[PDB]
């Protein structure tokens, strides 16, 4: 569900600061820390310049008077190691860390009475997104560092908690703000500086790749405990891919890599479900748009194959591949040829899902000629003979993309020759996705004799009625008949040329 959110978001403490005070700075850089310590007096002075502070005797706010307010060529260096301090210990946790800081581009309200510092305007520079973690992270060190203090301190003091005294991630961001803009002058006053500064969304779609590498280590498992964490992650790329450009083709390839880990199991079995929702996954992967993929369908003719010696889950993957395919309608020819080898296992010979699917695989002339034959067969009316037509039928159906009008108006006449055989199951249900077929397929004169098939319901439907009459004084039988006489009117669904009407 957090993987849901993440993708929404794609469309007794243990502080941990870094060690400072053995890390070792080039003396160089202490000229730059001259520098930045400068502006920290001046800019200081300048806030105390903004509510009409001066310089006097002693500390007294009260007085509108500071000591400190003396100018920076006034102090000692020690002095000025009071605020080099954190500014030292800010760069010895950078140089711990290994952050470059480098020489690089060139370098850069009435007045009150006392010391006027005229400062350069620090607080205006834009941090890049990967300074601005920079930043985000040496505001972190100083929350570690200074919390770590406050916890080892309190905790010296017998004292219970802090609000500050939480992970840098926890809080509300003006709290990041507290010590970010902080940093920020840190980080600021380097890029104004124009000094090298380094540590030295997508993220989603990469660690989906990384995804992919754990998933080779799920092909090591394939060599055979962590594997069941890895197919709840399985389940995390289903509804990851329910969230669902060239990254993105090569996480499809990576489906494609899963889908043929997969494969290798295709000839506990919720598992396998979830593999049959990573072929839906699969056809996210056809949404993308090497030629490995192509490979997968070399399994599918051997695996057809199988079928000639007439297990089945891989040829329900095949059907979901093949609804992959009709996103290619939404939408190597030579492995399309092999899909064709498969169309033969097919025509050699339950199966008729996989059948759907090779209708699906659909998506020359001699194609016409053996769907002419086809129809010379549908002449004919076993029926599951038929059943294995319907994947002609709606292949005949994406042929249309003329005289498939009328030979779809033919086929109008094989749903009479449905109707004839519904005059009396379960592959009256598949001829009821082969009305699914004439849906797709979708005169009046046909559909007159279809109206005549009509009458035939309503003889059904009085000889029903009848046996209800009979009930007066056993309806399960002229239930179905129902049903299938439903299907009939989803026929007519497909007949909805109201306004010729």
């Not at 929404?8 to 403490?13: D, I, K, M």
């Not at 699917?357 to 004919?380: D, Q, V």
């Given at each position: 569900?957090?993987?849901?959110?993440?993708?929404?978001?794609?469309?007794?403490?243990?502080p941990?600061?870094?060690?400072?005070?053995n890390?070792?700075?080039?003396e160089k850089?202490?000229?730059?820390?001259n520098?930045?310590a400068?502006?920290?007096?001046?800019?200081?002075?300048?806030?105390?310049?903004?509510?009409?502070?001066?310089?006097?005797e002693?500390?007294?706010?009260?007085?509108?008077?500071?000591?400190?307010?003396?100018?920076?060529?006034?102090?000692?260096?020690?002095?000025?190691?009071?605020?080099?301090?954190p500014?030292?210990?800010?760069?010895?946790?950078?140089?711990?860390?290994?952050?470059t800081?480098?020489?690089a581009?060139?370098?850069?309200?009435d007045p009150?009475?006392?010391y006027?510092?005229?400062?350069?305007?620090?607080?205006?520079?834009?941090?890049?997104r990967?300074?601005?973690?920079?930043?985000?992270?040496?505001?972190?060190?100083?929350?570690?560092?200074?919390?770590?203090?406050?916890?080892?301190?309190?905790?010296?003091?017998?004292?219970?908690?802090?609000?500050?005294?939480?992970?840098?991630d926890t809080?509300?961001?003006?709290?990041?703000?507290?010590?970010?803009?902080?940093?920020?002058?840190?980080?600021?006053?380097?890029?104004?500086?124009?000094?090298?500064?380094?540590?030295?969304?997508?993220?989603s779609?990469?660690?989906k790749?990384?995804?992919?590498?754990?998933?080779?280590?799920?092909?090591?498992?394939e060599?055979?405990?962590?594997?069941?964490?890895?197919?709840?992650?399985?389940?995390?790329?289903?509804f990851?891919?329910?969230?669902?450009?060239?990254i993105?083709?090569?996480?499809?390839?990576?489906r494609?890599?899963?889908?043929?880990?997969?494969?290798?199991?295709?000839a506990?079995f919720?598992?396998?479900?979830?593999?049959?929702?990573?072929?839906?996954?699969?056809?996210?992967?056809?949404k993308?748009s090497?030629?490995?993929?192509?490979?997968?369908?070399?399994?599918?003719?051997?695996?057809?194959?199988?079928?000639?010696?007439?297990?089945?889950?891989?040829?329900?993957?095949?059907?979901?591949?093949?609804?992959?395919?009709?996103?290619?309608?939404?939408?190597?020819?030579?492995?399309?040829?092999?899909?064709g080898?498969?169309?033969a296992?097919?025509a050699?010979?339950?199966?008729?899902?996989?059948?759907?699917?090779?209708?699906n695989?659909?998506?020359?002339?001699?194609?016409?000629?053996?769907?002419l034959?086809?129809?010379?067969?549908?002449?004919?009316?076993?029926?599951?003979?038929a059943?294995?037509?319907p994947?002609?039928?709606?292949?005949?159906?994406?042929?249309?993309?003329?005289?498939?009008?009328?030979?779809?108006?033919?086929?109008?006449?094989?749903?009479?020759?449905?109707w004839?055989?519904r005059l009396?199951?379960?592959?009256?249900r598949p001829?009821?996705?082969?009305?699914?077929?004439?849906?797709?397929?979708?005169?009046?004169?046909?559909?007159?004799?279809?109206?005549?098939?009509?009458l035939?319901?309503?003889?059904?439907?009085?000889?029903?009625?009848?046996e209800?009459?009979?009930?007066?004084?056993?309806?399960?039988?002229?239930?179905?008949?129902?049903?299938?006489?439903?299907?009939?009117?989803?026929?007519?669904?497909?007949?909805?040329?109201?306004?010729?009407?």
């Amino acid at each position: 569900c957090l993987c849901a959110i993440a993708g929404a978001l794609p469309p007794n403490f243990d502080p941990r600061p870094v060690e400072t005070l053995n890390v070792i700075i080039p003396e160089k850089l202490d000229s730059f820390i001259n520098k930045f310590a400068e502006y920290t007096h001046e800019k200081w002075a300048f806030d105390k310049i903004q509510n009409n502070w001066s310089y006097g005797e002693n500390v007294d706010e009260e007085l509108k008077t500071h000591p400190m307010l003396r100018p920076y060529k006034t102090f000692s260096e020690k002095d000025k190691e009071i605020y080099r301090w954190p500014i030292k210990e800010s760069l010895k946790a950078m140089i711990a860390w290994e952050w470059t800081i480098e020489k690089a581009r060139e370098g850069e309200y009435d007045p009150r009475e006392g010391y006027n510092p005229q400062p350069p305007d620090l607080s205006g520079v834009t941090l890049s997104r990967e300074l601005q973690a920079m930043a985000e992270q040496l505001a972190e060190n100083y929350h570690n560092t200074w919390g770590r203090k406050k916890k080892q301190e309190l905790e010296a003091k017998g004292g219970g908690t802090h609000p500050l005294l939480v992970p840098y991630d926890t809080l509300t961001a003006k709290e990041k703000a507290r010590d970010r803009e902080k940093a920020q002058e840190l980080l600021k006053f380097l890029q104004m500086n124009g000094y090298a500064v380094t540590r030295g969304y997508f993220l989603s779609t990469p660690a989906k790749v990384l995804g992919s590498g754990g998933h080779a280590s799920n092909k090591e498992k394939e060599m055979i405990f962590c594997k069941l964490a890895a197919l709840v992650r399985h389940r995390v790329s289903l509804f990851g891919t329910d969230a669902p450009l060239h990254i993105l083709a090569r996480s499809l390839d990576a489906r494609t890599v899963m889908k043929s880990g997969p494969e290798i199991v295709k000839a506990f079995f919720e598992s396998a479900s979830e593999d049959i929702e990573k072929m839906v996954e699969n056809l996210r992967l056809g949404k993308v748009s090497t030629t490995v993929a192509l490979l997968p369908v070399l399994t599918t003719l051997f695996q057809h194959i199988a079928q000639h010696q007439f297990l089945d889950d891989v040829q329900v993957s095949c059907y979901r591949t093949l609804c992959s395919i009709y996103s290619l309608g939404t939408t190597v020819e030579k492995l399309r040829p092999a899909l064709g080898e498969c169309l033969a296992r097919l025509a050699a010979a339950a199966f008729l899902e996989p059948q759907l699917n090779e209708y699906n695989a659909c998506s020359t002339l001699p194609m016409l000629c053996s769907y002419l034959p086809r129809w010379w067969e549908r002449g004919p009316e076993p029926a599951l003979p038929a059943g294995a037509p319907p994947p002609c039928t709606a292949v005949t159906s994406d042929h249309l993309n003329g005289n498939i009008l009328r030979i779809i108006v033919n086929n109008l006449g094989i749903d009479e020759a449905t109707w004839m055989k519904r005059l009396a199951v379960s592959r009256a249900r598949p001829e009821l996705l082969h009305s699914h077929f004439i849906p797709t397929i979708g005169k009046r004169a046909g559909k007159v004799v279809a109206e005549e098939e009509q009458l035939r319901l309503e003889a059904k439907a009085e000889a029903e009625e009848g046996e209800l009459l009979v009930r007066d004084e056993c309806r399960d039988l002229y239930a179905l008949y129902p049903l299938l006489i439903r299907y009939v009117d989803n026929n007519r669904a497909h007949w909805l040329p109201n306004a010729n009407a």
